[PDB]
Amino acid sequence: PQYFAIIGKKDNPVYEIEFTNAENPQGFPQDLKELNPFILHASLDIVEDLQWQINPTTDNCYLGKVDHFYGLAITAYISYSGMKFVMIHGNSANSSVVIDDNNMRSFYQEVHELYVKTLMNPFYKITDPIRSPAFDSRVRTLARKHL
Amino acid sequence: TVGPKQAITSEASTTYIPSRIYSESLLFKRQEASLSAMAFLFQEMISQLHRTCKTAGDFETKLSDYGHNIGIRLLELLNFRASSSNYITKMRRRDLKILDILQFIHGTLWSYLFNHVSDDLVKSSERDNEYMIVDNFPTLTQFIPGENVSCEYFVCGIIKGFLFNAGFPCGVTAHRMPQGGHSQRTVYLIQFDRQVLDREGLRF
Amino acid sequence: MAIETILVINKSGGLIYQRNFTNDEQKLNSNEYLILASTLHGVFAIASQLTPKALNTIPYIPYVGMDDFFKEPFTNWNKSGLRQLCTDQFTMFIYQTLTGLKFVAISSSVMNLAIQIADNFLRKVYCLYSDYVMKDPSYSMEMPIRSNLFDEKVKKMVENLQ
Amino acid sequence: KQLFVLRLLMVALLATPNKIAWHPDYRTLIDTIIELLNINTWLILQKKILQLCIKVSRKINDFEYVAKFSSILITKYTHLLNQSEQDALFKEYIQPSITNESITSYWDPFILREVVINRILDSDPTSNEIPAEFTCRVQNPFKFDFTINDIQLDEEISEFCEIDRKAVSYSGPYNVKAESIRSITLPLIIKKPTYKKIYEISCLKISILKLPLQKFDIINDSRR
Amino acid sequence: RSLKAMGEEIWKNKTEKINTELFTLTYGSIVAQLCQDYERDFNKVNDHLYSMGYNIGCRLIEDFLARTALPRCENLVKTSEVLSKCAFKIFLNITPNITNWSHNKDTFSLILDENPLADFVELPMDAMKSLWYSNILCGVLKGSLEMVQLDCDVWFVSDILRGDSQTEIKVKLNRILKDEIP
């Protein structure tokens, strides 16, 4: 299971979704209610640290797994307007994420495309939650096809 | 009813495909319109703001907010279309110096808003954090008498809206320096703050 | 042919624009131009009113000016109305527009083709009026012309004519 | 990350089976964890910090802070505190406060709507003796009022007026509803003859199981 | 010679081109600010966009007649042909066509296949019954047509952005009996 989020510049979320494998019909045992918002706000610190630097620990829009913490692989992405696309990776065992950078990158690229399609609405201003079910339908089909 | 400010939903991956409702191509088709129609909408903008405002200053800030609401849109659209959709593409530089986002403006923004590239772009010798962006002929506002400058703030309202949302907060004012054969030349100067500069003071 | 004094009147009132430019002299302009513009407004209606028992109107392009504004022969919106006035010292060329707005060029040249070059020139100054006054947001409707830019847009046109 | 490890300290101190007395390191810890988020953005995390801060200040047994952070959790009233489930614990952390020092002026002045002060005579033989304003005579006035929280047991007691004339009331010890606008019944002014001069009134005094508080003025205007 | 031919000729002389996306962005910022400052009361902003469009069209007609010289439209089907073939073809790059006349030929519907005034726009849900988005043309289609003394009234029926199938505007004229004496 994976918790996905898009966070504003003033530390607020515009999108949040949690999606799991169907074998575990309930997902993230006891971490979902308490741990997963807090470790994401913790990772916002180090994504804010690496946004301004030149040579990382190329092209600065994607970046790798940013930390590893209670066996959870936390993967980020930084848009052009400053939005941050932090999405974590859970499993009962340890998880490999770097092998999915052939696929994950493409996933962050077209959800960036979806966010640009959201932003081009003149009615939708920033610091608003993305309250659209069509956006949910596209991001869960992209979650299915980029598993 | 998907994302409120109240909770997060949990739904399984690899389930059924849901309905298809709305979609559109992000890449631009090449569309053209007359200069007269956009000039008419521009003077109607300035006429309504002349009608519903008292003095010059808050009129200028309202016009700059009008430009801001194009610029914060326009940043991601131009960078995403300069990176290249469903077609396989990567991610540009996402530039983070001061001296190359102004290069990005003078190269791509003015050649996107207008047919022609922006003319000159120089620094200030007398002081740092002051940058000159200059054209020779403003095609937004060529239809007003030249002694008023406040109607020229809309386009620099774009530029502040291009800059503050990109991570470099700043402030812009515009003046008219009648140099050479061009009677209207329209310098826009960009005043940054100290808190960005020492940031790139920290980065060697 | 040669144009020496320009006058733009209202569609329903006293005039908006007047210039006695390129006459290197001082003539009176204060408050008699409003009276004469109102009498032109009256006698256009009087000159249209009488009908001789009759019971065309096409211009030609001479490439006047200086990419011109139009490259084809065109049409006219005053079939039965005053078109010029001819005296000893001047000929006055008038051209009205379909909305009711008229344009007056007092020409000090003395004594057919003059109507063609006059209608072409006054259609070009109608084009510059539309492109440089009606676009202005500060210009309210049916007020005197205050644009400084319209001045050197028409001075250069007249000094390009001769 | 300092926010996360102070949360870890506070939740590890929460789950102990022992008991611990008051100590001002807890005081400076509570002020730096409240001031650490910019509280006085994300709101779910602010709820999840002060929902632990109220439990720690209960476990320390200092009721001034559970009263204070309950009257800071009143800012997040109209969303993200669900339909009397978390408002049940928001009650059971505020009932021992309201039976103790928490005597603040019921969390908001946005309770009273625009009341109407008509009177209903029954005789056509008497009508408006004289030589907007109301021209009162007898009958009685009427008020209506609401609260907006998901909790129950908002209890008005002894609703009466200001430093105006001998307009009085009788008794008001009954309830008012949770979400709706319950119209409170007849207050029955027993008015006294005075001088002709007009002067409007802002509001009237209502206690919520306390002493009678200040104004709680009318919404959107003074509504004279 | 024919209007449907020479409109393209005016489309390649003395029409300085500008990108339509900028026009959409400034119109979207106008209607977004108008939505915001009127406290989400969506019936007033159609009236305010009409009051802007009247002052657009009453100055636009004197530029349209200046750029292309035409005689007066002797019947209103010629008015429909010039609005279909040169008025929206010179200024915008769109060719709408006319359908759905009244039987006495007083009313005409201007079906409009795609609108280049609203590309990226998705309306909010509370505004989905009481805001016609591209209202501004209706003021133009009063104003310009009120200055050639075709005293008409202009109103929408349906649009694609409100979930209906098509965008069309139905205009009918009331009286004329007025014009320049010449």
Notable characteristics:
part of a larger assembly; 5 chains; B: 204 residues; alpha+beta; 4-stranded antiparallel β-sheet; C: 162 residues; Trafficking protein particle complex II-specific subunit 120 (chain D); ER-Golgi transport (chain A); autophagy (chain A)
Task: Write up what this structure looks like.
The structure is cut from a larger assembly and holds chains A (147 residues), B (204 residues), C (162 residues), D (224 residues) and E (182 residues). Helix content of chain A is 35%, strand content 21%. Chain A is α+β, with helices and mostly antiparallel strands and 147 residues long. Chain A has one domain (1-147). In chain A, helix 2 packs antiparallel against helix 3 (133-145). The longest helix of chain B is centred in the middle third of the chain and has 28 residues, at 56-83. A 4-stranded antiparallel β-sheet of chain B has the order 3-4-6-5. In chain B, helix 2 packs across helix 4 (153-163). In chain B, strand 3 (120-123) and strand 4 form a beta hairpin. By secondary structure, chain B is α+β, with helices and mostly antiparallel strands. Helix content of chain B is 40%, strand content 13%. In chain C, helix 2 (113-132) packs antiparallel against helix 3 (148-161). Chain E has one domain: Trafficking protein particle complex subunit 3 (Muramoyl-pentapeptide Carboxypeptidase, domain 2). The two termini of chain E are 25 Å apart. Chain E has 5 helices and 5 strands, in the order αβαααββαββ. Chain E is globular, with a radius of gyration of 17 Å. Chains A and B meet through strand 2, helix 2 and helix 3 of A and strand 1 and helix 2 of B. Strand 2 (13-20) of chain A pairs parallel with strand 1 (10-12) of chain B, so a sheet runs across the interface.
What is Rg of chain E?
17 Å
**Which architecture of chain E does the CATH hierarchy give at level 2?**
2-Layer Sandwich
> Domains counted in the coordinates of chain E: how many?
1
Major beta-sheet overview of chain E: 4 strands, antiparallel
User: How are the strands ordered across the major sheet of chain A?
Assistant: 3-4-5
Shape of chain A: globular
In total, how many beta strands of chain A?
5
The description of the largest β-sheet of chain A is: 3 strands, antiparallel
Tell me the number of structural domains of chain A. Answer: 1
The end-to-end span of chain E amounts to 25 Å
Strand percentage of chain A lies at: 15-25%
Overall 3D form of chain E = globular
Order of helices and strands of chain A: EEHEEEHH
* Main sheet: strand order of chain E: 2-3-5-4
Q: Figure out the total of helices of chain A.
A: 3
Assign the CATH topology of chain E: Muramoyl-pentapeptide Carboxypeptidase, domain 2
N- to C-terminal distance of chain A: 10 Å
PDB class: transport protein
Keywords: Complex, transport protein
Entry title: Intact TRAPPII (State II)
Chain A: Trafficking protein particle complex subunit 20
SSE blueprint:
This is part of a larger assembly, with chains A (147 residues), B (204 residues), C (162 residues), D (224 residues) and E (182 residues).
Chain A: E1 2-7, E2 13-20, H1 31-50, E3 62-69, E4 72-77, E5 87-89, H2 101-119, H3 133-145
Antiparallel strand pairs in A: 1-2, 3-4, 4-5
Helix pairs in contact in A: 2-3
Chain C: E1 5-8, E2 17-19, H1 32-49, E3 84-86, E4 91-96, E5 102-107, H2 113-132, H3 148-161
Helix pairs in contact in C: 2-3
Chain E: H1 3-11, E1 17-19, H2 20-37, H3 42-67, H4 76-90, E2 97-99, E3 107-112, H5 136-146, E4 151-158, E5 167-175
Antiparallel strand pairs in E: 2-3, 3-5, 4-5
Helix pairs in contact in E: 1-4, 3-5
GO cellular component, one term (chain A): TRAPPIII protein complex
GO biological process, one term (chain A): endoplasmic reticulum to Golgi vesicle-mediated transport
Subcellular location (chain A): Golgi apparatus, cis-Golgi network; Endoplasmic reticulum; Preautophagosomal structure
